[PDB]
Structure formats: structure tokens, C-alpha cells
């Protein structure tokens, strides 16, 4: 059991379609989105921030990153 | 169970009546109707034998289903 596991399973209580990292089959040492979300929430809790605020800011940062890679892929398609 | 005949088609109505006989469980109860008395001591033996043949049929269906599902998946 990992300390971040409840937060990883709380990320499973959301949008399930996130990444093709599991059948990518390139390496077993890069974390996926849910594990890094849970680690972010865990280290925020270890800082002393509130719990719900930790999930809110971690989800907002993830959504910002996903929109930024969406617009980056849009730039790739505009160059393509 | 009553079935209407439409456009003089006897075979279609008879097929529908047979299907409603079977799916309502009434055919199973009619087939299970006895002509002589069966003691409880013989009902126990009959239930034991029926459970044994059900176990064997379930095992056979499981083996056929495992073979067919493993073959159809292309492995």
C-alpha cells in the first residue's frame, strides 16, 4: 500500500480517459497522471495545506497542463 | 395461456403457444407431474441424482465455453 493510493483512487472517481501510457510499453518507471496527482496531493498535505484545497489545486494544475498540451498539439497540427 | 390466430396461420400461433408454454415454466411443471406417489425418502434420492447430473452438465458447459472463447479470441 502506498500513502498516495487513496488520492490515486480518487482520481479514478473522475474522467477515466487520460493516457495511453499503460499500453505504451516503453518503460515501467515513468509515473502516470494519477500517481503524480496523488503524490502532489500527498506532499501538499505534508506541507500542511487543507485537503480539499489540495485536491482542487492539483486538479486545476492538471487541467491547465492538459489544455497546454492540447494547444501544443494544435500547433503541431497547424504545422502539419 | 391463450393465443390468437392471425390471418389463418395455425403454425405461427402454435409456435407462439409452445414458446409461451416453455417460457412460463408451465411445460416444466407439466412434465414433472407424477402418476404415482413418491415418498419423501425417494424424493431425497431423486434430488441428489438431479444435482449430480446438473454438476456434470455445468462442468461440461464450462469446458466447452472455455475452449470456444479461448479459440475465438485468436490466441
Amino acid at each position: 500500500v502506498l500513502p498516495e493510493d487513496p488520492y490515486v483512487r480518487r482520481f479514478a472517481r473522475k474522467h477515466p480517459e487520460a493516457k495511453l501510457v499503460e499500453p505504451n510499453k516503453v518503460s515501467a518507471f515513468i509515473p502516470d497522471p494519477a500517481r503524480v496527482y496523488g503524490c502532489r496531493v500527498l506532499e501538499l498535505t505534508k506541507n500542511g495545506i487543507s485537503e480539499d484545497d489540495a485536491m482542487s489545486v492539483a486538479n486545476m494544475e492538471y487541467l491547465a497542463e492538459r489544455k497546454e498540451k492540447k494547444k501544443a498539439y494544435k500547433r503541431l497540427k497547424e504545422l502539419a | 395461456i391463450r393465443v390468437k390466430v392471425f390471418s389463418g396461420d395455425l403454425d405461427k400461433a402454435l409456435t407462439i403457444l409452445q414458446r409461451k408454454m416453455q417460457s412460463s415454466g408451465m411445460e416444466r411443471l407439466i412434465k414433472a407431474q407424477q402418476t404415482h406417489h413418491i415418498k419423501n425418502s425417494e424424493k431425497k434420492v431423486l434430488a441428489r441424482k438431479n444435482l449430480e447430473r446438473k454438476i456434470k452438465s455445468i462442468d461440461f458447459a464450462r469446458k466447452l465455453q472455455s475452449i470456444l472463447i479461448k479459440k475465438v479470441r485468436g490466441l
Binding site: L2, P23, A28, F29, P31, R35 | K70, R73
Partner: peptide, 28 residues
């Protein structure tokens, strides 16, 4: 168990192989 404990504080080393996920999809 020191090394397994260190490497469990990482990404996902507990990812099921393709054959196990295939059989789990087969059983359901």
C-alpha cells in the same frame, strides 16, 4: 526489503503484463 521498497517509491512498477490483462478481459 530495502531495494523493492525504494523502487516502489517511483512510477508504476506494479503494472500487469499484456497476457494477464488479456486473460482478465477473457474471463469477463
Amino acid at each position: 526489503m530495502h531495494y523493492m521498497g525504494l523502487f516502489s517509491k517511483a512510477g508504476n512498477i506494479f503494472r500487469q503484463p499484456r497476457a494477464m490483462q488479456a486473460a482478465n478481459a477473457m474471463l469477463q
